[PDB]
Amino acid sequence: GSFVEMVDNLRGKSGQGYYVEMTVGSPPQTLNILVDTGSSNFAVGAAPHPFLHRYYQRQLSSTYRDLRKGVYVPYTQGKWEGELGTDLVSIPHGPNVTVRANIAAITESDKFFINGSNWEGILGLAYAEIARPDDSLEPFFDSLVKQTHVPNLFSLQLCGLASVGGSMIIGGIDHSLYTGSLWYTPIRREWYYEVIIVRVEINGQDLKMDCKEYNYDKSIVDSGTTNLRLPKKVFEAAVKSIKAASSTEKFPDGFWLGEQLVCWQAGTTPWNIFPVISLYLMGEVTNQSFRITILPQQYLRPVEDVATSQDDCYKFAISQSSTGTVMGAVIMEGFYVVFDRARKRIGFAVSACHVHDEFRTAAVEGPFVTLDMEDCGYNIPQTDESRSHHHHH
Ligand SMILES: CC1(C)Cc2cc(Cl)ccc2C(N[C@@H](Cc2cscc2Br)C(=O)O)=N1
Ligand SMILES: [Zn+2]
Ligand SMILES: [Zn+2]
Ligand SMILES: [Zn+2]
């Protein structure tokens, strides 16, 4: 389990995320577990399901312990529930260690497991504050670091239903996985991997919004979300600008809504008419920022259709949010992303696995200096619910 032993430890399907192999219990049960930086629970399918043929069998693990407490996790479009416990956990293609970690055994779920996902669980890599049922349930990566000498850092190379590969390096940075500059942006608060967007450009034109609109009500880096997701005012601005550039094509509404493909004749897709998008992230130095630039190849995603082998067909992978900006697989695929928990920051470098345009490339570039501008962070109104709960830690 060197960094060479962790290179190419991820796999996935397109638009259904990336998974890593983990062994739970003794004797080991090997399971394919989705890597999810936008959540904080380790949870694994643990009863029969029509879309699963393997799951975690608690009864076959001699080292399993029941915490005698349930957890229930509702999402916008489904849910899971289960029994908490602890078991022994290792990553065959990751560090050479075993840890005792919390595991939610998923006993029931709705619209969580889909047809041909090929993962049987979720590895929440975010921080304790967002773990269910409360932040006292220690997340997997926190247990890894407290129990071993593994450095407090991990990095993801996610390479661009269709197969996809990648690398999760645990406790390090592998220079083979990126070229050129590694740029860091501060983690704003340790809950999600929350960051601050100071500027957005579409083919060099500034959206000119109050910078707080970009981060309303947060901006996060989330490997468990497919799209780039944008607060509604920002989404409208961006689509208006993207439509302007590509105006030689008049797409149906449903395309802009992510509901419909649009096609061209095989090999003739007019990429040059779709703009690059640059997101400027707050730099470590107080005046500075740096930009990540994504190609339209990143935000226009291919689906090989069924009455269409003659055609190249695409889905628009930028969608509206009412919960902030989410930089999902659409952003991360271009990049080597370093989650530097130890130093409270997130690095970006251009990935060595590159989905590149004939003329242009996805880029990581700085610094850019701002005499002033602003605090671009948004302060989420504090509920009485969140104010009262004690955090004796
Ligand atoms: C992290 C995870 C699995 C959490 C989740 C829970 C539920 Cl109930 C439904 C969809 C998702 C979900 N949706 C992704 C798409 C997706 C479905 S499976 C892996 C991925 Br990435 C998204 O909204 O972009 N992601
Ligand atoms: Zn293996
Ligand atoms: Zn108290
Ligand atoms: Zn607490």
> What are the chain's domains?
18-150 (2.40.70.10), 151-393 (2.40.70.10)
CA dist 59 and 46 (Å) reads 10
* Residues ≥6 apart with Cβ < 8 Å to 53: none
Alpha-helical regions (H) of the chain: 140-147, 232-245, 253-256, 296-299, 329-332, 384-388
Phi, psi for residue 145 in degrees, rounded to 5:
-75, -40
CA dist 233 and 251 (Å) reads 21
Helix (H) or strand (E) holding 322: none
Closest CA to 241 of 206, 211, 215: 206
Closest CA to 340 of 134, 227, 184, 131: 184
CA dist 252 and 266 (Å) reads 20
Tell how far the Cα of 135 is from the centroid of ligand 4, in angstroms.
5
**C-beta separation of 119 from 33 below 8 A:** yes
CA dist 209 and 213 (Å) reads 7
CA dist 252 and 234 (Å) reads 20
CA dist 354 and 130 (Å) reads 33
Give me 200's structure tokens.
């957005």
Alpha-helical regions (H) of 161-302: 232-245, 253-256, 296-299
Give me 182's structure tokens.
């590694």
**Which residue, by CA, sits nearest to atom 20 of ligand 1?**
16
Residue with structure tokens 């269910």? 132
Closest CA to 215 of 141, 321, 319, 120: 321
- Beta strand 205-206 with 10-13: parallel, antiparallel or unpaired? unpaired
Closest CA to 367 of 293, 295, 284: 284
Question: Which residues in 96-162 belong to E strands, given as ranges?
Answer: 99-110, 121-124, 154-158
Give me 311's structure tokens.
């055609």
Chain centre distance of CA 381: 25
Q: Is 357 a catalytic residue?
A: no
Question: Which residues in 266-391 belong to E strands, given as ranges?
Answer: 277-282, 288-294, 300-302, 311-316, 318-321, 325-327, 335-340, 345-351, 363-369
Residue with structure tokens 């739970």? 24
The CA dihedral of 102, 106, 110, 113, to the nearest 10 degrees, is 90
**Which residue, by CA, sits nearest to atom 24 of ligand 1?**
225
Q: Is 36 a catalytic residue?
A: yes
Ligand nearest to the CA of 23: 2
Angle at Cα 123 formed by Cα 222 and Cα 129, nearest 5°? 70
| Catalytic residue chosen out of the listed positions 36, 87, 142, 312 | 36
Tell how far the Cα of 45 is from the centroid of ligand 1, in angstroms.
15
CA dist 1 and 170 (Å) reads 9
The single-letter code of the amino acid at 389 is: H
Resolution (A): 1.8
CA dist 264 and 348 (Å) reads 33
CB atoms within 10 A of CB 310: 9
CA dist 92 and 278 (Å) reads 37
Tell how far the Cα of 49 is from the centroid of ligand 1, in angstroms.
17
Closest CA to 256 of 267, 269, 247, 266: 247
Angle at Cα 58 formed by Cα 165 and Cα 66, nearest 5°? 115
Tell how far the Cα of 35 is from the centroid of ligand 1, in angstroms.
11
Ligand nearest to the CA of 22: 2
Pocket of ligand 1 (CB under 6 A): 16-17, 34, 36, 75, 77-79, 111-112, 117, 224-227, 328
CA dist 163 and 50 (Å) reads 22
Give me 359's structure tokens.
């003329």
Give the three-class secondary structure for 176.
Answer: coil
CB atoms within 10 A of CB 228: 24
Residue of 106, 108, 226, 327 with the most ligand 1 atoms within 8 Å of its CB, for mutation: 226
CA dist 72 and 109 (Å) reads 10
Phi, psi for residue 106 in degrees, rounded to 5:
-75, 120
Give me 80's structure tokens.
């899971």
Residue with structure tokens 């919390």? 102
**C-beta separation of 234 from 320 below 8 A:** no
| Catalytic residue chosen out of the listed positions 87, 142, 222, 312 | 222
Give me 364's structure tokens.
């990581």
Around ion ligand 4, residues with a beta carbon closer than 5 Å are 135, 391
* Residues ≥6 apart with Cβ < 8 Å to 15: 161, 226, 301, 329
Q: After which residue numbers is the chain interrupted with C–N beyond 2.5 angstroms?
A: 160
